[PDB]
Amino acid sequence: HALVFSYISFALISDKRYQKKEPLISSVHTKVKGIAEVKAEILENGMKKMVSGVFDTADYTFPLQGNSFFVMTNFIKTEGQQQGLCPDFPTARTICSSDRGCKKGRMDPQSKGIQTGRCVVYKERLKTCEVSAWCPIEEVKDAPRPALLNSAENFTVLIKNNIDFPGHNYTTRNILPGVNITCTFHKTQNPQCPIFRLGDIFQETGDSFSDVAIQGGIMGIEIYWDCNLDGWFHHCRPKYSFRRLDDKTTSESLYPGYNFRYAKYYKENNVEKRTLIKVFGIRFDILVFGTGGKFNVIQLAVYIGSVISYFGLATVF
């Protein structure tokens, strides 16, 4: 009988039924470091071109917005586009035998322009449907074989997190004072180091960083706060985990990976022009979840409220 009430008291102790718990408030500030040297050969419009250059922080990333940041790992440039008419890029949907194959005004999800209803030669007696759009249309080409910014895994993101508990008067930050900032997070050797190498993140989740860096993906950093605001036992430290939020579908229809089309408008020869940059990379979403706990009498009097009935039926047997 009494051991049953020690099981109730156990449920209280271990389940922290005596504590009030409150959802944590998270603010995030991330600063990434590293530079990537890009020397590769890439064929554009059937002509080989040499891509050489250095990429510093400004060239491959922007500031954190909404608790997530992005790291361009690959890209494709289509310079000199300008408003006009041009034959769409040859694909199963763009290729026409005669003017009747193209319907004027038609626009297909794969096309970047509105059809003109006319069939015209793209190259060497091979005709696609003419469209109106930014010309010439970007190639329906795959990303470079090895990701141009393959060095991305060697980069290091420094994460600084500030968690607040409105219910209590308690606020704290990921980086406690006086810690040795020279470190690299390790599941075991540096569980509280806020410097994270990207390749390490991809290994922890068991995903090859290069593969994802070719077409892009969405990684995810989780920060757990099981904080105890009690004077007796008080613990409040983060728990870093890693999960690949990216879907990994691998189906043209579900737009696999992570990539977006960036536009850089400029004027040349009194003409309105636009360089189009298809950008691939990993987007890192930082997910911070917390629960603050303190001693509460009302919760112990309600838990007592249930335990006194449980006690009456326990004594009835």
Next chain:
Amino acid sequence: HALVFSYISFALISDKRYQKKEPLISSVHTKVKGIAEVKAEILENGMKKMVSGVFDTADYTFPLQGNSFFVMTNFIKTEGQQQGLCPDFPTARTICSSDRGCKKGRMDPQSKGIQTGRCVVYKERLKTCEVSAWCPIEEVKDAPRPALLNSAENFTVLIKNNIDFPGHNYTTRNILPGVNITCTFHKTQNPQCPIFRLGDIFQETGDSFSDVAIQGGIMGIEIYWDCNLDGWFHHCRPKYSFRRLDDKTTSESLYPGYNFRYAKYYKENNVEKRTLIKVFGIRFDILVFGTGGKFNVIQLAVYIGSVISYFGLATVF
């Protein structure tokens, strides 16, 4: 008497008091499709101008940041601005009879520059207060009558959501494998289709897409997760709803609609210049709320704790 305890047991079953519930973690990835052909006539500075051009994804949208994305539906361009002095645009506040009407250094919330304290002619013996700013000052003109990118309603946003339950070992995604991705969400015909036409969203909420697209607004996509992590009955699917978060005030003071001023800096003739683009559109905020539920003994022993007292008083009558 016993029917009272069947009412308690009912409250348990229907209220899921036996389950532990946990807040869901949401990651969002949105890819929008569609292109808008813009041919319209718009008067700038008293002179008619012809706006013709095609707008692809890159021209009217940027990537999702913070679980929300934006779709430019209208705009106004003020090309060639450069640092200098110019007479402010004529309005009830800018118009002066004499140099005494303007105070040097004064800046009014409607003005885009600091007054020079001098009264100067803007056009045809009509004087406004001279200011220092990007010159010439953007017209205090209304947005184009029909939204230039009125085609926006025909666009389709594909939403991909990944929800995780840290408490459990359970993670899932909006798009289950093998589904027919060729679809358009319908309240009844496609409750799980993640392709959403914008016009459909505006109809569901009962707002004309054109009206909002003229001056801009903030729409809102809600995704409900009432997931049951029990082995007996396990359900975990999203519930799409639509709500217009935009205020719809219609008062100059409350800055109605959604619009922002974008700056494009460029150099011409060894001069620093800036094209100013007032941008109008709908911002789409994706709100994902979830609750995961599993069987918990401590909660059933505490609910039992209350139900045994309720039982004692029920028997006392």
Next chain:
Amino acid sequence: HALVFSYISFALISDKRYQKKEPLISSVHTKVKGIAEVKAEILENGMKKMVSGVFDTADYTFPLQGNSFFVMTNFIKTEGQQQGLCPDFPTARTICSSDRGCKKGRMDPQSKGIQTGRCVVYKERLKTCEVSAWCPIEEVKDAPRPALLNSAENFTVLIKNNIDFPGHNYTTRNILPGVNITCTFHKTQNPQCPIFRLGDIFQETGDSFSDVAIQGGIMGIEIYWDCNLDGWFHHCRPKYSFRRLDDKTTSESLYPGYNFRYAKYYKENNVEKRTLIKVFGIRFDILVFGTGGKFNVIQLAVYIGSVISYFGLATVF
């Protein structure tokens, strides 16, 4: 004895144990107003330069993304950078006595380029390690003494918040209809005014706006919703508080303040060039927390469930 049951009933009344509480859904829309006149003298590469110009909304801010916005308060420009080789900027780590001091391919976290392994003169027989990068390398210089956009504190952010309670059928907005929008938030004189002067925010938190505006920081706006969805007593208004989320470390290693490196690519003389803008400012994170409360029988029958045991043991004494 009975006073004990009035203490239980008190815990019910004051703790609102009879109510079901639900987490609030927050949407935020912020429009900032103000313009800053920048006239200052700043030395670049050992030569004095005069920075004069006006800065309107477009020049110093972008739209809210993820419930936070940014206000550039200071900056440093490095115009004309272009891909090439150049001697790194002289610092304790870049300075070399001989070619042996530099290792080819080496890249240090402070460096913005990959070393060429060669020691070259930066200026006046003082040699740094040659690197490949955007040349010339940005100066390792401190921000301007008084923040160029020191006027930032006089700016006014208008915040418009829309909170929804999915559980109930209840939705509301920060700005109730018909209120006098002409106001400035005051802890006591305007607790519901949604116009916030920045300097006021920094004073409330007890931080000098100028100091933070020199190197940058992360401020934080909190909006409390302790809403009561009961018909008897119904209150649903926001509670504005201010907290400095910024860390304030003041250690080179922890990247103190708030600043990022922005890149503006342009072409000159058939050459690829890049103006680099180190941007400093305050990022304002808007934290909205809410709890909606209504009357619930199941919660009053479970609280009664605990209170009937508490009653039995109370009577046992």
